[PDB]
Design an enzyme around this catalytic site. Structure first.
Site, short mmCIF file in Angstrom:
data_model
loop_
_atom_site.label_atom_id
_atom_site.label_comp_id
_atom_site.label_asym_id
_atom_site.label_seq_id
_atom_site.Cartn_x
_atom_site.Cartn_y
_atom_site.Cartn_z
N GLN A 19 0.97 3.25 -0.68
CA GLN A 19 1.87 4.15 0.03
C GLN A 19 1.20 5.40 0.57
OE1 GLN A 19 3.99 5.42 -3.97
NE2 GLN A 19 4.54 6.89 -2.36
N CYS A 25 7.81 5.78 -2.27
CA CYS A 25 7.82 4.80 -3.35
C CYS A 25 9.10 3.96 -3.34
CB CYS A 25 7.64 5.50 -4.70
SG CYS A 25 8.88 6.79 -5.03
N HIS A 163 9.99 7.79 -10.07
CA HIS A 163 9.09 6.96 -9.28
C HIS A 163 9.62 5.54 -9.19
CE1 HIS A 163 5.41 5.97 -7.21
NE2 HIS A 163 5.05 5.09 -8.12
N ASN A 187 3.08 -1.30 -8.95
CA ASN A 187 3.07 0.03 -8.35
C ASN A 187 2.68 -0.08 -6.88
OD1 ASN A 187 3.27 2.82 -8.12
ND2 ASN A 187 1.88 3.27 -9.82
#
Ligand SMILES: *[C@@](O)(C(=O)NC1CC1)[C@H](C[C@@H]1CCCNC1=O)NC(=O)[C@H](CC1CCCCC1)NC(=O)c1cc2ccccc2o1
Length: 220
Positions: A19, A25, A163, A187
């Protein structure tokens, strides 16, 4: 439910993305969950455009590189009738004017399911639905520089589980005694971070300490 789940093994998960410096996110979590559900429905794994979400989901409440919600992104896809592919609408880590083109849409959704705030409900969803959008606490230096092993959240469930990430499964590594369970989490900080972009989050730690605060997934 089985004691181990890994949706990557069934072809549900695209390679890890990055990202960059953009508070997006939520968009990567949403595209991951939608990629999983689209694959389950169609058998085709197609990377989706986070930039499309960043640029266009303002009317549903998101604020681009300044944050947003996965649910607002699912709502945008439903209202919009489509979402462009990653290849057709590439990621730039900055918000631009909305460039959505229905000709390059490769995905759809019919709403979303919010999972109740319980470890067991999240585990059932992960075991039966596919990858699940969730929010975790990613603020500590120990997470920013995480490389390997099970990550244990310091400050329990404080009020910045901020997150958005993607739970692609769960498992355990039974050692000497305690099983020591973990969530398998994708992630959006690139392949270089963590275990090839993934983190094992400590699982079933203690009540009121979790990752099930804002779990959801789109319907297709
Ligand atoms: C992500 O964690 C992220 O992109 N992190 C990388 C920059 C390091 C963001 C970070 C967030 C946004 C950018 C500005 N400063 C920040 O800390 N986190 C979110 O976007 C967060 C995710 C949701 C997921 C579901 C549970 C609640 C948190 N969302 C927001 O911060 C947010 C949501 C929202 C909706 C309307 C208007 C503003 C707004 O902000």
């Amino acid at each position: 439910a089985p004691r181990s789940v890994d949706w990557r093994e069934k072809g549900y998960v695209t390679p890890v993305k990055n990202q960059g410096q953009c508070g997006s996110c939520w968009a990567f979590s949403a595209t991951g969950a939608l990629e999983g559900q689209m694959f389950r429905k169609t058998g085709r794994l197609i990377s989706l455009s986070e930039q499309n979400l960043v640029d266009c989901s303002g009317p549903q409440g998101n604020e681009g590189c300044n944050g947003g919600l996965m649910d607002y992104a699912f709502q945008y896809v439903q209202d919009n009738g489509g979402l462009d592919s990653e290849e057709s609408y590439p990621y730039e880590a900055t918000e631009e004017s909305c460039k959505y083109n229905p000709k390059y849409s490769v995905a759809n959704d019919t709403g979303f399911v919010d999972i109740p705030k319980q470890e067991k409900a999240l585990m059932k969803a992960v075991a039966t639905v596919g990858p699940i959008s969730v929010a975790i606490d990613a603020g500590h230096e120990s997470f920013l520089f995480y490389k390997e092993g099970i990550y244990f959240e310091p400050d329990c469930s404080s009020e910045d589980m901020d997150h958005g990430v993607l739970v692609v499964g769960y498992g355990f590594e039974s050692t000497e005694s305690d099983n020591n369970k973990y969530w398998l989490v994708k992630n959006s900080w690139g392949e270089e971070w963590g275990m090839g972009g993934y983190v094992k989050m400590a699982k079933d730690r203690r009540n009121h300490c979790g990752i099930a605060s804002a779990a959801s997934y789109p319907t297709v």
